[PDB]
Amino acid sequence: IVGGYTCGANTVPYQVSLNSGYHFCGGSLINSQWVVSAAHCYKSGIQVRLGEDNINVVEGNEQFISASKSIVHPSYNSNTLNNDIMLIKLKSAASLNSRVASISLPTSCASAGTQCLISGWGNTKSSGTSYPDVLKCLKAPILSDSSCKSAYPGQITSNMFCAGYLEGGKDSCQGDSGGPVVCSGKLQGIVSWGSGCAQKNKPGVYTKVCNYVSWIKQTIASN
Numbered sequence: 001i002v003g004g005y006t007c008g009a010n011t012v013p014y015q016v017s018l019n020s021g022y023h024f025c026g027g028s029l030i031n032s033q034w035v036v037s038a039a040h041c042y043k044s045g046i047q048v049r050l051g052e053d054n055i056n057v058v059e060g061n062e063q064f065i066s067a068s069k070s071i072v073h074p075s076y077n078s079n080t081l082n083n084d085i086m087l088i089k090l091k092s093a094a095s096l097n098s099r100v101a102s103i104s105l106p107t108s109c110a111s112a113g114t115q116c117l118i119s120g121w122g123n124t125k126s127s128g129t130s131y132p133d134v135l136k137c138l139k140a141p142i143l144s145d146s147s148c149k150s151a152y153p154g155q156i157t158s159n160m161f162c163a164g165y166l167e168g169g170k171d172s173c174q175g176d177s178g179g180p181v182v183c184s185g186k187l188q189g190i191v192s193w194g195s196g197c198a199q200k201n202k203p204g205v206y207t208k209v210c211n212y213v214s215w216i217k218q219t220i221a222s223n
């Protein structure tokens, strides 16, 4: 997250870190047994880390649970990032309390102009590299469909939305991939793609979670 702020330990209790020997992506806990992340974050050997603030120090609220199954969306296209969503099943159910909790799935799609909360352990620099230890947050508005299409002509599908700041300076970044965009207490987006981070006229692009709720529900009911 570039241009954001320190969230505060355990204030984003649905945020997870995906670990394959090191943090590599975010995700969102949606059920005691399931995490939603980006399909571009797929890899074998994922450990889900819940209850994290500092990802380099054991602070006492963590739950580390290995993935038992990963399910990339059937229509994921890694070239366009259309349908950039994946479900991860946990080997055992997380214990839910204040510091670890699920986030609700949306009923209705989110509105242009709504301020959402984006969070993660990704790079904090637009130019160069610096990776934080504690969870960072950014409040960012959903942009209009026409603005999003102007920023990325020919590339925005109905399964994507932009959020952020056309002026630059505030954005999600590498390492935030797969993490949550929460609007009015619902998971509306997944950190998906863009062109660099916090550059002028290149806001973040996010998977539009509302379009996937039927697939998520059916998949969790059968796996």
Ligand SMILES: NCc1ccccc1
Binding pocket: 171, 172, 173, 174, 175, 176, 177, 191, 192, 193, 194, 195, 196, 197, 198, 203, 204, 205
């Ligand atoms: N600045 C949007 C973004 C986020 C994660 C990965 C690539 C691009």
Ligand SMILES: [Ca+2]
Binding pocket: 052, 053, 054, 055, 056, 057, 058, 059, 062
């Ligand atoms: Ca920790």
